[PDB]
């Protein structure tokens, strides 16, 4: 009985995002997406530690889905028989049945089709949630992503002015709980079920062994740094399905930030660091003003530098010496300087 146009969307691997319109004059459609669960071993850090992961569409995070307010979202969730466990999906964007989880439990070899109406604007987490202790275990094994529900008129500043991004990236942050042996070395397992008991013990102490973006320490540094150009307004969606995070763009700011992630609320302006509550997605716009490398971190710097949670942007353009300049390059402290007389000596 739902007589709307159907449009199939092809998802792409994070941190990129499938093509979409920001503002649209199209009416509501049934937007059709497919997510296929893939359990597999994945490399999670720069020393080559492996991990028994569970994913949507083979990535951590799962891909970003983008629709507009009033669309209906029809998701085919597939659990191939190569997998070992039941899975489902819970959309924080959806209303009813545990976000869809109570309508989408599928064994290996099955698929299910869920439709939810996009009545709430913002960025939202989705995640697996099979029941009981399987819920945190599936989520921290990698089974979470996000969906963005745009207003039909695109974003605005909460004061009646349209905002438009030239570029969008989705940063999914994942807390991982990898067992160690008596000698402190990370343990390897041949299957998720073999890893479970030792992993649940780590999970219980609430301290991750790794905190990563796009599934691995160093995933978004090196060759895979995020590109931008001076002058571009970049939307950075950030999600964390299980644990808080405090994003920060080193060298930049959040010009407009929806840290609770919901576009019916005006963004805050000019933030240094924002806060993604575990179980949510938030979003920040920033217009780059200076070229060079930027680091994007969670600003627990121990997690950023030592547990995996740093991404880079490489920004092309011309340097603005009015905003910042090195007035004098490093030089020997003048013989005649008098620092021994400072109040704190």
């Amino acid at each position: 009985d739902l007589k709307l146009p159907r449009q199939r969307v092809d998802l792409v691997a994070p941190p990129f995002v499938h093509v979409h319109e920001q503002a649209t004059k199209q009416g509501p459609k049934i937007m059709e997406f497919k997510l296929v669960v893939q359990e597999k071993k994945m490399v999670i850090d720069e020393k080559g530690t492996t991990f028994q992961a569970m994913t949507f569409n083979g990535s951590m995070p799962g891909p970003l889905m983008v629709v507009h307010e009033g669309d209906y979202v029809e998701v085919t969730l597939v659990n191939p028989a190569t997998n070992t466990m039941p899975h489902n999906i819970d959309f924080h964007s959806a209303t009813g049945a545990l976000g869809g989880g109570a309508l989408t439990l599928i064994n290996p070899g099955e698929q299910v089709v869920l439709r939810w109406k996009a009545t709430r604007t913002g960025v939202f987490v989705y995640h697996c949630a099979p029941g009981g202790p399987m819920i945190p275990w599936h989520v921290v094994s990698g089974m979470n992503g996000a969906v963005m529900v745009l207003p039909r008129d695109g974003l605005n500043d909460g004061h009646g002015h349209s905002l438009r991004y030239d570029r969008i990236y989705y940063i999914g942050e994942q807390d991982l709980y990898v067992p160690r042996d008596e000698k402190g070395n990370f343990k390897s397992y041949d299957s998720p079920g073999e890893a479970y008991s030792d992993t649940e013990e780590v999970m219980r102490k609430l301290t991750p062994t790794h905190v990563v973006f796009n599934g691995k320490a160093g995933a978004l540094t090196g060759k895979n740094a995020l590109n931008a150009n001076v002058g571009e307004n970049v939307l950075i969606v950030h999600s964390q399905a299980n644990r808080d995070s405090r994003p920060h763009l080193i060298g930049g700011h959040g010009d407009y930030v929806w840290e609770t992630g919901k576009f019916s609320n005006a963004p805050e302006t000019g933030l240094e660091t924002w806060f993604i509550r575990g179980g949510s997605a938030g979003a920040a716009l920033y217009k780059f003003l200076q070229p060079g490398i930027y680091a994007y971190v969670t600003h627990n710097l121990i997690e950023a530098a030592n547990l995996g949670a740093t991404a880079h942007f490489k920004v092309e353009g011309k340097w603005n010496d009015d905003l910042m300049t090195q007035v004098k390059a490093p030089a020997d402290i003048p013989t005649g300087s008098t620092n021994e007389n400072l109040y704190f000596q």
Copy 2:
């Protein structure tokens, strides 16, 4: 010299709330409450682990007190001689004398009467705070609750529209620090003072062993699920006197959320997950749209599923297939499906 009407309030055990008016045309009154401290052993999880608790009025959390802006709140705090320790009370709603703590220290066998003016609207924590290391110990042993100070015109949306709830629940979240023996089993003690040294060691590492609503894992599930009906606007007050929390209604949203908990600030709209800073109370309204079970959690899902922090709502009414529907029930993956060609394989 304070010549106002006096009204005695009878408190009730959480998660229920004593009867009150939302909007009132009554003038300020002296609202009289009594809290009796009760130290006692309590069961805190589904395996029957016991714990040396300290409570106001025999419950964790202590009961919710509800008054209106400009009332005066006259609290008789009683410390029966069956108790072993001194206690006091600190109202985050009150101004002066450490919230009342510096005026309410009573030994076993004593009582004291404190009056504070309700000059600040919102939901607020109250807790015991005897001095020094006894402050965190009394609080994480259970000695905390909340008080709601309503505007006289009731709640509003921060944009000039009245809000009214059909139902209110108070969810007090408690972080507990239970010692374990060498074998990892929780230890039992015959008194709070006997438990202290081993408990303080657990407290120092800042990681709770249990995170519970209404005093126990499973307290608000099963027979004690919270009731509601499709169409009702439900106010959910959430407090945490010592540690952050990130509430989330699974299958729902926060339609209006005061996460910092103070009604002089407009709520945010349409949240997925909100944030209760340790040492505060916040509040969320939600109008139920779908029947069924909902889980209400902190969205560190490890704490929710594995450390005790899940409540349920059971909502009666008719399902709305426009908001969400199972288009196709679980079925075998079609022989002709072509998932091996997906971009992520």
Copy 3:
């Protein structure tokens, strides 16, 4: 080519703040500051535990710098040859080059001069960030402070009314990670580099051993309590460069709070407890209404009472019995009282 007046500022040790104007009719200037790095052993708790610290200007936190929107800030950073390590500086207030870090790396015996334009209003962290694992290590060793960029018209309430403070304090909160020996005693080291390996192991588990204001447990209690008077509007800037905090004034409120710390956003009103995300500074105004001692804490009360994170204010003035009064002093529970009949027995 930058032809503006230069003004040299002399910094002072926290929690005090160098003199400045709130509102100004002066135009933009080049505000010149000097920060000298000092590595040295410091006492961090009341039992005399010592710690291999690294500081700007010999204090934890580093001093508060105060300028106005549109000023340029010219910082001479000095790394005396008595120090052992390279250092730099990253201003979260600045745009470009990793906040200045990529332009300010100096070896012992060198100094460098950085200029940044104060285009963003608010309170902001600054911290050392030499590269890789040295970034969290330098920061949690003490190398962080804050800078406040005031609007030229001073603060306002976000609703078109000027706010002015009679007194300002800067509370820098520091998470410290001190190794312990097999017996649980804190270890001492003869140099930062000797402390590093054992300290990084503590840092990795993300749980501090101490959480302190102004560099030490008890720094702002006793003789060094913060002074105020009934009626004064006090601005309390709070920073945390690495880890979240939840400030609370016991006995008071935050009348106006910028918890994300940026003055282009309206403050929230009448908070009990606010939230400083790790990697940021926030600010709260409060007009004292009652004399006496107040405790200012992070409201994880375990951190406040047991890990060092309590400050005091001593407020002079006359008590207001309308706001709060002890109606009846502690007395024996009446023989005729009937508490055995209460609902919770």
